[PDB]
Each structure stands twice: as C-alpha cells, then as structure tokens.
Amino acid sequence: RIPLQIVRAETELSAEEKAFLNAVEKGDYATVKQALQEAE
Amino acid sequence: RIPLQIVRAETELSAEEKAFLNAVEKGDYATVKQALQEAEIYYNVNINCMDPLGRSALLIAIENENLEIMELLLNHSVYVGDALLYAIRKEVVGAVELLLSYQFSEFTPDITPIMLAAHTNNYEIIKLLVQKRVTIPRPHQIRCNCVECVSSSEVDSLRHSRSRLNIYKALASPSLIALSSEDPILTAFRLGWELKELSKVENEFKAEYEELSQQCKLFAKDLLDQARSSRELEIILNHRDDLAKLKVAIKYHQKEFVAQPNCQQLLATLWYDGFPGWRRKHWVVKLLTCMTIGFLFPMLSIAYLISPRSNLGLFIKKPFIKFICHTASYLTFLFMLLLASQHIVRTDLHVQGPPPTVVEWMILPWVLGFIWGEIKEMWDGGFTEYIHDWWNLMDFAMNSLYLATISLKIVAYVKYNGSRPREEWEMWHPTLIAEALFAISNILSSLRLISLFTANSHLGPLQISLGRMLLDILKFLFIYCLVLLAFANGLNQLYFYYETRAIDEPNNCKGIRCEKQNNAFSTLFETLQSLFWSVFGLLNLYVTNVKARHEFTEFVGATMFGTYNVISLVVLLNMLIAMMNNSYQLIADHADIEWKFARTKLWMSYFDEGGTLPPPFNIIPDSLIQNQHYQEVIRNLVKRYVAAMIRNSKTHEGLTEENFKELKQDISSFRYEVL
Ligand SMILES: CC(C)CCC[C@@H](C)[C@H]1CC[C@H]2[C@@H]3CC=C4C[C@@H](OC(=O)CCC(=O)O)CC[C@]4(C)[C@H]3CC[C@]12C
Ligand SMILES: [Ca+2]
Ligand SMILES: [Zn+2]
C-alpha cells in the first residue's frame, strides 16, 4: 500500500510552446507562420 | 435428421434501438443528436441500450476513435461505467484524456485503470495516469499465514490467485518501473528474484512468473546497454546502495547483465593489471611468460612476506599473478603426491608403525595450509554461501580424509612398536586403513583440478555443459537402482540354497573376484556386485550353474540373468543416450553466457586482498555526491532507452491505421467544408 509518483520529472513547457508544437505536428502553413511572427 | 435451433436466445432490441445503434456506428453528428432528443422527449430510444454482443454506443464510438460523439453522449449523461478500460486497452490517448476530463464485461472485476495501463506498457498513458496520484496494492509475503490471506484463500482461491498474478504483472512493467522507481536496476534485480522464487511456490502458474522474471532481466540488461562512456559505466557499476552493483548482480543471478560486452571489457582491464596489451602478444610468448611466472612462485611470496611495500613484493597483489602462483603451488603439491608412491623415496614395507618419510614431512604443511584456508574462507565470507558451490563439498571430503589419515598414522605409531609379516596382519590394521584413505584422498585431490578449466576459452563451455548434464544422469540413476534391486532380490532368493564354503573351492577363493568365479548369487551383497559388474561384461556365463544337476533351476537362473541383461543394456542405456542428446541440444544454446558468468565468478575471487599467499606460505604468522551522479546517469539511460523503444514501436500496422484514420478525417473535413 504505497502510492506511485514521478521521480525523474521533466520540466514541461508553457501553453504557448505546447500550442506551437501541436500546430507544427498537425501541419498549418499559416498558423505556424503567425506563431513564428509572434515569437519574433 | 434433427433440426438446428437457437438454445440460448438473446433478447433483441426494438427497431428504434437498432436504428440508434446503426446511426452511432455509421457516424452522423446530427442524426444521433435528434435520436437523443427523441429519447429525451418521447423515450423512444433507451440511452443505455446494449448490442447483443455487449457493445454500447459509447463503446462503438470508442472503437471508432471519434471524440465528438463521445463528448456529446457524456454531455447527455449516458452510462459511462467500464469505458476507461476499453479506451486504455485500445491505447487511444485522446479518448483516455476525454473520459479522464469527466452486466457483461470483458474485464475481470479486480482490474484498475492503472493496472491495465501497466499491463499494456504504454509510457504516454502510464505517465498520464500516474500524474493524477494513483496507487497500486502490494501483496503479502510468499509464505504468509495472516488471517486475511487465509480467509481469502479459503473463500475464492481462483480470485485470489488471479488478483496476485495481475498485481505482479502490473508491477513488472518496464515503463512503470522507469517512471516510478529511483533505482530501476536494483528494482528489476529484486523483482526478478522474487518472481523466480514465487514460480516454484505457485507451481500451477509457473510459466507466467518465469516470463515475468525474464522480462525484468531483459529490462535491466537493455538499460545497461545504453551507456556511452567508461565514466558512465564505472559510475553504474561502482554504485554502493569496490564493484558493489556487480556483486549484487552476481548474487541475484543476472547472467545476461554480467556477460554484456562493456562489463566484460572492464573486468578484463581489471584482471590484466600488470600486462598492458596482453592480447597484442603472441600465444608463444604468452605461454613462455606463464611458465616463467609459475616457476618463481616460492619467490614473490617470500618477498611479499618480508617487504610488502617493495617493488618485488607488490607483484603478487595482481590477480593474474596470484592465480598463476596458486596454480603452480597446487601443481607442486600434486607432483609431490605423485612422488609419494615411487620406489625412490619409499622403502621398508615391513614395519608396523612407520615414522613419517621425507615426502610425507614435506606434504604435511600443504595439508595444514589447505585446512587453514578452508576454515578462514568459511569464517570470512558467509557460512550459508560456503555450501552453495558444490566444490567445497569435495574440499571438505578431501580434508576430512587427510585428517583421518594423520590420526590413524599417529594412533598406529603410538600403539605398535616392532615388526611383523604383512601377510599375517589383521583385516582392520590402522596402517592399512590409513593407506586406503590416503589413496582415496589422492584421487579426490587430483580430480579437483577440473575447476581451473573455466579460465580457458575452449574447455570452459564444455565443462559447463557436462556439469549441466550431470543432474539428468542423477535422474536416471534412481530407475536403474530400483531395477537392480528387484533383480538382485529375485536371483538371491533363487540361488541362496546352494552356498559353498571357501574350503572346497580351488585356491580357497570365494566370490567373483577369483580366477574361477563362484558363489555369484549366494548373498545379497555378492548378487549386487555381480549384477553391477555384468554391465561391463566382466561376469562369466558359467556362474549360473549349480554343482548338482538341477536343470530347471539352472535354466530359470539363466533366463533371469538374460532378462536383466536385455533390460539394462538394450533399453535403459539407449534411453539415457536419447535424453542426453535432447538435453545437450537445449544446453548448447546458452553456453557462452553461462561460461562467462562462471569465469566472472572465478575472476572476482582474486580481486580482494584476503588470502593472497598460497597454502604453503599462508600458515606462517561522500555518499550524497555519488547519489547525484548516479541519478544523473540513470536519467540519461532512461531517456535514451525510452526514446529507442518509442522509435522501435513504429510498426506497419500502426502506421497504416494512423494514416487511414488521418485520411478519413481530412476527407470528412473537406466534404463538410464543401457542403
Ligand atoms: C591432461 C593432462 C595433461 C593434465 C595435467 C594437469 C595440469 C598440467 C593441467 C590440468 C588443468 C590445467 C589448467 C587448465 C586451464 C588453465 C587456464 C589457462 O588460462 C588461460 O588460458 C587464459 C587465457 C584465455 O582466457 O584463453 C592457464 C593455464 C591453466 C591454469 C591450466 C594449467 C595446467 C593444468 C593445471
Ligand atoms: Ca574451497
Ligand atoms: Zn498475509
């Protein structure tokens, strides 16, 4: 009776980075362009 | 001519329910919506309607991996029970997230979502579940008498065993181990050991526990193969909870972990301390170096005794040099044993109690050193480990025989003083008994030299294979002994009426060790000896004849002997050969791993600084930083292993299904945009 946790935790990225990665994976020639403009 | 019907009929649903299920299966975001509206208003459709093959609308949508219908049904408050398990088994992360966002079943009622995810070994779903603070029950000891275990085993043994197996199968998941354990290697070692021990207590479910232990061992090895540097390898191998982790792996019987090429290279580097580029040299020069180092064994030892810090005294501290010196010392002892039984050094065979000769005086210190070394090793190193070697038994028997020989010689020297012809000595003379014991101990000590074969690349695997077949030889011995006892009983019963005294036999010799064999079946002991010696053809055929002319008895005895010969020499030996072949076929596959494990065990015994001197000369009188380094290396290894396994998971079936689903989604989106 011992709980299970995460020992070697990974530093997650922000919602902006997650959205950028999602757009890159899905494929959007314009959404990725505007995301890069926002990053700039 | 009998018709076929349906016996276990299923209660069919109405046309409304059939249409609703058809619409759900086909996919219609509006038709299903209006059907749910109709079910809400007029109750024409059951929201909890079930397929005859136990497949609700939510299950159909889950198997269709379309999330819009599932979200709408969840908003409509449909029975959602036991759907997360279907999503987990189908291994659909989006659907699993959707249900996690808030009768008849294909799953046993003890299965939890975390246990099912662990059974699947999906890292992405296991991490998602563990992120929400889930727990897993842990079972009781292998041999537990607590009331709760006894009651559970007394009410539902099938349920108890299935639950235990499910819990262990979940705990033995490589992804769960990597995600939730801080020492994955040690956890795999311990879990594999526990599963191997449990497989023989639950003999019915033996194969499942065996496969789980094999899985744990494979995980530990594959984690080890992800090291990229000698520094990382040394950090892994030297971590103390000098090669502590390697010693733990040896203790837990991790043969594939130990025999990995990176570990063997480190061990060889440690083994050849004083011979850089040993494999660069020719076999001839290596052989000559072996001989020269062997001959200088009395020196390098006196040097170590009189000046350990000197340049000469530090040579014997190397493992290979120590091994060579010990081998040379043992060979010298065996050569003196050979010299003991010669005409040059031993004469005057007529004395009752003889003083020890020069060869025996030279022999005694070696025996004392052997006994002292055995006792010292047994004290320092663990008493229970001393018996799990199967060579220490030979050592114990040999040393006991030597002690008995010395005691009998002393007793004879004390008791007897004078001379007497050897032909008129009694049967149990102490000198005779001591000589017999000395000969037996000589045989054992000469046979001990087998254990040095594991150090050679050609003889080691062969020796391991033969030692592996010995157990099945022992298995056949039982049946042979039973058959021998049966036939000995019969023959002795038939022939015990015709015993004769040694006076009436020629040369006054009685038994089967005479030139004319007689009285072969007069006693049980003699019958056993005769039936043993008939296996090799050393018993003559006229031993079945009695002095009187009892032809019926002689024929019955001859038929008994012939039946025994047929059964023993035509059937049992050929069956032994067949099963020897079968055993060797399986043994020959893993010869390299077993040989390397044995050689590693042999090498590791010369690394420590205890017992450096051979037996002839051995009777003369921070943690936190290491933890952080280990954690960093473990992080790197786990990341590399997970990435490699993920890239290996790319399969044709999965890629085809993903491409088909994506093409269907894009086609539907384009059709909707056009419409
Ligand atoms: C069959 C007759 C000649 C036996 C005579 C007895 C001894 C002269 C023999 C018996 C077993 C031999 C040993 C068997 C194996 C080895 C390991 C061997 O080590 C290697 O081969 C290391 C290199 C490698 O790994 O191949 C060094 C010699 C040695 C100790 C041998 C030395 C000579 C021994 C003691
Ligand atoms: Ca020993
Ligand atoms: Zn219990």
PDB file of N, CA and C in Angstrom, chain B residues 597-625:
ATOM      1  N   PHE B 597      29.560 -16.094 -17.084  1.00  0.00           N
ATOM      2  CA  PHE B 597      29.167 -15.915 -15.688  1.00  0.00           C
ATOM      3  C   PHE B 597      30.099 -16.677 -14.752  1.00  0.00           C
ATOM      4  N   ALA B 598      30.419 -17.928 -15.097  1.00  0.00           N
ATOM      5  CA  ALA B 598      31.320 -18.720 -14.265  1.00  0.00           C
ATOM      6  C   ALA B 598      32.716 -18.110 -14.216  1.00  0.00           C
ATOM      7  N   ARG B 599      33.219 -17.640 -15.358  1.00  0.00           N
ATOM      8  CA  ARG B 599      34.544 -17.033 -15.383  1.00  0.00           C
ATOM      9  C   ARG B 599      34.575 -15.723 -14.608  1.00  0.00           C
ATOM     10  N   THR B 600      33.492 -14.946 -14.648  1.00  0.00           N
ATOM     11  CA  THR B 600      33.422 -13.734 -13.838  1.00  0.00           C
ATOM     12  C   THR B 600      33.451 -14.069 -12.353  1.00  0.00           C
ATOM     13  N   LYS B 601      32.698 -15.095 -11.947  1.00  0.00           N
ATOM     14  CA  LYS B 601      32.725 -15.514 -10.549  1.00  0.00           C
ATOM     15  C   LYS B 601      34.121 -15.972 -10.139  1.00  0.00           C
ATOM     16  N   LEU B 602      34.814 -16.689 -11.026  1.00  0.00           N
ATOM     17  CA  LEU B 602      36.171 -17.135 -10.719  1.00  0.00           C
ATOM     18  C   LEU B 602      37.139 -15.958 -10.622  1.00  0.00           C
ATOM     19  N   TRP B 603      37.036 -14.995 -11.542  1.00  0.00           N
ATOM     20  CA  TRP B 603      37.924 -13.838 -11.521  1.00  0.00           C
ATOM     21  C   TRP B 603      37.722 -13.001 -10.266  1.00  0.00           C
ATOM     22  N   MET B 604      36.466 -12.793  -9.862  1.00  0.00           N
ATOM     23  CA  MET B 604      36.186 -11.897  -8.747  1.00  0.00           C
ATOM     24  C   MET B 604      36.741 -12.403  -7.423  1.00  0.00           C
ATOM     25  N   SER B 605      37.095 -13.684  -7.332  1.00  0.00           N
ATOM     26  CA  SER B 605      37.628 -14.233  -6.093  1.00  0.00           C
ATOM     27  C   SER B 605      39.093 -13.890  -5.868  1.00  0.00           C
ATOM     28  N   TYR B 606      39.784 -13.361  -6.876  1.00  0.00           N
ATOM     29  CA  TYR B 606      41.174 -12.951  -6.740  1.00  0.00           C
ATOM     30  C   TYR B 606      41.345 -11.443  -6.657  1.00  0.00           C
ATOM     31  N   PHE B 607      40.249 -10.679  -6.681  1.00  0.00           N
ATOM     32  CA  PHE B 607      40.352  -9.225  -6.626  1.00  0.00           C
ATOM     33  C   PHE B 607      40.645  -8.729  -5.216  1.00  0.00           C
ATOM     34  N   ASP B 608      40.050  -9.358  -4.205  1.00  0.00           N
ATOM     35  CA  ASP B 608      40.212  -8.900  -2.836  1.00  0.00           C
ATOM     36  C   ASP B 608      41.614  -9.223  -2.321  1.00  0.00           C
ATOM     37  N   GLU B 609      41.967  -8.596  -1.201  1.00  0.00           N
ATOM     38  CA  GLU B 609      43.305  -8.691  -0.635  1.00  0.00           C
ATOM     39  C   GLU B 609      43.429  -9.759   0.442  1.00  0.00           C
ATOM     40  N   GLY B 610      42.381 -10.542   0.683  1.00  0.00           N
ATOM     41  CA  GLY B 610      42.443 -11.616   1.656  1.00  0.00           C
ATOM     42  C   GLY B 610      42.891 -12.919   1.012  1.00  0.00           C
ATOM     43  N   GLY B 611      43.745 -13.646   1.723  1.00  0.00           N
ATOM     44  CA  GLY B 611      44.275 -14.896   1.206  1.00  0.00           C
ATOM     45  C   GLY B 611      45.172 -14.733  -0.002  1.00  0.00           C
ATOM     46  N   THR B 612      46.076 -13.751   0.030  1.00  0.00           N
ATOM     47  CA  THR B 612      46.959 -13.519  -1.109  1.00  0.00           C
ATOM     48  C   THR B 612      47.989 -14.632  -1.252  1.00  0.00           C
ATOM     49  N   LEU B 613      48.481 -15.161  -0.134  1.00  0.00           N
ATOM     50  CA  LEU B 613      49.560 -16.132  -0.175  1.00  0.00           C
ATOM     51  C   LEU B 613      49.026 -17.547  -0.397  1.00  0.00           C
ATOM     52  N   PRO B 614      49.752 -18.364  -1.156  1.00  0.00           N
ATOM     53  CA  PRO B 614      49.332 -19.754  -1.384  1.00  0.00           C
ATOM     54  C   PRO B 614      49.404 -20.567  -0.105  1.00  0.00           C
ATOM     55  N   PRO B 615      48.760 -21.732  -0.071  1.00  0.00           N
ATOM     56  CA  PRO B 615      48.637 -22.508   1.179  1.00  0.00           C
ATOM     57  C   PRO B 615      49.971 -22.851   1.828  1.00  0.00           C
ATOM     58  N   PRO B 616      51.029 -23.176   1.071  1.00  0.00           N
ATOM     59  CA  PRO B 616      52.306 -23.463   1.750  1.00  0.00           C
ATOM     60  C   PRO B 616      52.829 -22.303   2.578  1.00  0.00           C
ATOM     61  N   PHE B 617      52.574 -21.063   2.164  1.00  0.00           N
ATOM     62  CA  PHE B 617      53.087 -19.889   2.855  1.00  0.00           C
ATOM     63  C   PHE B 617      52.036 -19.150   3.672  1.00  0.00           C
ATOM     64  N   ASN B 618      50.785 -19.607   3.680  1.00  0.00           N
ATOM     65  CA  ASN B 618      49.720 -18.871   4.346  1.00  0.00           C
ATOM     66  C   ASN B 618      49.505 -19.301   5.792  1.00  0.00           C
ATOM     67  N   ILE B 619      50.291 -20.254   6.298  1.00  0.00           N
ATOM     68  CA  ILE B 619      50.208 -20.648   7.703  1.00  0.00           C
ATOM     69  C   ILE B 619      51.298 -20.014   8.552  1.00  0.00           C
ATOM     70  N   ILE B 620      52.264 -19.334   7.942  1.00  0.00           N
ATOM     71  CA  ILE B 620      53.305 -18.630   8.685  1.00  0.00           C
ATOM     72  C   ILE B 620      52.717 -17.329   9.217  1.00  0.00           C
ATOM     73  N   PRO B 621      52.717 -17.106  10.539  1.00  0.00           N
ATOM     74  CA  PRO B 621      52.156 -15.891  11.131  1.00  0.00           C
ATOM     75  C   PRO B 621      53.172 -14.759  11.226  1.00  0.00           C
ATOM     76  N   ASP B 622      32.297  10.610  -0.033  1.00  0.00           N
ATOM     77  CA  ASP B 622      30.960  11.059   0.336  1.00  0.00           C
ATOM     78  C   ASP B 622      29.895  10.218  -0.360  1.00  0.00           C
ATOM     79  N   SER B 623      28.675  10.257   0.172  1.00  0.00           N
ATOM     80  CA  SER B 623      27.558   9.487  -0.365  1.00  0.00           C
ATOM     81  C   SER B 623      26.600  10.325  -1.200  1.00  0.00           C
ATOM     82  N   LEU B 624      26.341  11.569  -0.788  1.00  0.00           N
ATOM     83  CA  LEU B 624      25.373  12.399  -1.498  1.00  0.00           C
ATOM     84  C   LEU B 624      25.823  12.687  -2.925  1.00  0.00           C
ATOM     85  N   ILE B 625      27.103  13.017  -3.113  1.00  0.00           N
ATOM     86  CA  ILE B 625      27.607  13.337  -4.448  1.00  0.00           C
ATOM     87  C   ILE B 625      27.525  12.114  -5.355  1.00  0.00           C
TER      88      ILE B 625
END
